[PDB]
Every structure is written in C-alpha cells, then in structure tokens.
Amino acid sequence: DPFQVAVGVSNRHIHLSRTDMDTLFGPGAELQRKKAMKQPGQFAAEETVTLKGPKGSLSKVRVLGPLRRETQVEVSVADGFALGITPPLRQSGQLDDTPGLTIIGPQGSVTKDHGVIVAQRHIHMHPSTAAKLGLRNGDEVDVEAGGERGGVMHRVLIRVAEASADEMHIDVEEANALCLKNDDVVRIC
C-alpha cells in the first residue's frame, strides 16, 4: 500500500545559520553527526543549545544538520508556554512575523527577533511517490492513525522534493495524543 507512510516523531530542535553557528560554537565550528535521519543528508548533531524565553528556559535542545541559510527553532505548544512565548503554527521556512528567543551556546549567545514556530505536521515525499498518489507539492491531506488513541489528522502539508524520503513528521504532543512513535505506520486518505 503506497498510501502507508512511516512516522518520524520530531522533538524540539533548531536549525542554525553559519553566522549563528559561529557565534554559538565558535568560528569554523562544524556540526558533528550523532545520528543520521531518514531525510537524506539531514542528521541529529552532537551539538545542543539552551533556549531562553521571558518565562523560562529549555536545556539540551538538539541541533539538526546541515546548517541552513536562516535560523529556525521548532518547539511544541507546551514548550512555547514554558518559554513564555506564543509561536504560531507554520510550515518550515514560513517565519514572517514569528516570535524570537535567546539561543545560548558554549562560545556565545544570540537573541533572535524571529524564527520560532510550532511545526505544522507534514509529509516529506519523493516526487516519484507524489506522482503516483496524484499529489502536488503544497497540497494538504488527511492522515489516519489506528489504535486506542487513534484518529484522523487534517491539514497535513504535502512536501515534495527530490531530496526527500517518504516520511511523516509530527511533534511530541501530536504523537502522544495519538500514541504514535517512530516508525509507526499511518495512512493517507
């Protein structure tokens, strides 16, 4: 069944620019791969940061490599409340009018004015697969999960790129709400 995609539960994490990486970890510092992810080229790094908000802070927030053009922080709704901000629901890269935080690293700190979002659930899909299912990049779909806490998720963003592996990304709260874990199978409706 080509409609079955595996689940990747995305914990809170951060993408860093080269400039911000230099500030937080020192000039010329390279991310060290800790664990390779399903999406090709992407990985969880050894490096982590502390996120400080007006209300509180979060420690050991994972940095995901590779480095990107713009810094982006992804936190759960609960994470936001603990920090003392209200990050809006957004797809990756949609950072206009988003709130900021203070990122703290070993070599320095940077207080961002934007880049913090709650991740909108989505499916990374190969263009081959997307072509089969008659799905276009930018589409939204329904996804069903089984089990004692199962249900159907609306507004699942379809993300098609050549450098993609078939996988669904949901944050920790979405996963727990449906009793989903890494490598669980869900179905596109």
Positions touching a second copy (CB under 8 A) are 76-78, 89, 120-121, 142, 148-155, 172-174, 176-179
- From 164, 180, 20, 7, select the one nearest 92 (Cα to Cα): 164
Q: What is d(CA 116, CA 188) in angstroms, rounded to the nearest whole number?
A: 28
Tell me how far, at minimum, the Cβ of 90 lies from a second copy, in Å. 10
Question: How does DSSP assign 58-84, residue by residue?
Answer: EEEEEEEESP-SS-EEE--HHHHHHHT
Name which of a second copy, Zn ion, none residue 169 binds, using a CB cut-off of 5 to 8 Å depending on partner kind.
Answer: Zn ion
Q: Which two tokens stand for residue 88?
A: 């809006």
Strand ranges inside 66-138, DSSP E? 72-74, 89-90, 102-104, 109-111, 116-119, 122-125
To the question of whether residue 153 is assigned a binding role by annotation, the answer is no
169 makes contact with Zn ion (CB under 5 A): yes
Is the Cβ of residue 96 or residue 148 nearer to a second copy in the bound state? 148
To the question of whether residue 154 is assigned a binding role by annotation, the answer is no
Residues making up the binding site: 9-11, 13, 15, 37, 55, 62, 68, 74, 81, 122, 124, 169, 176
* Site for Zn ion, rule CB under 5 A: 74, 169
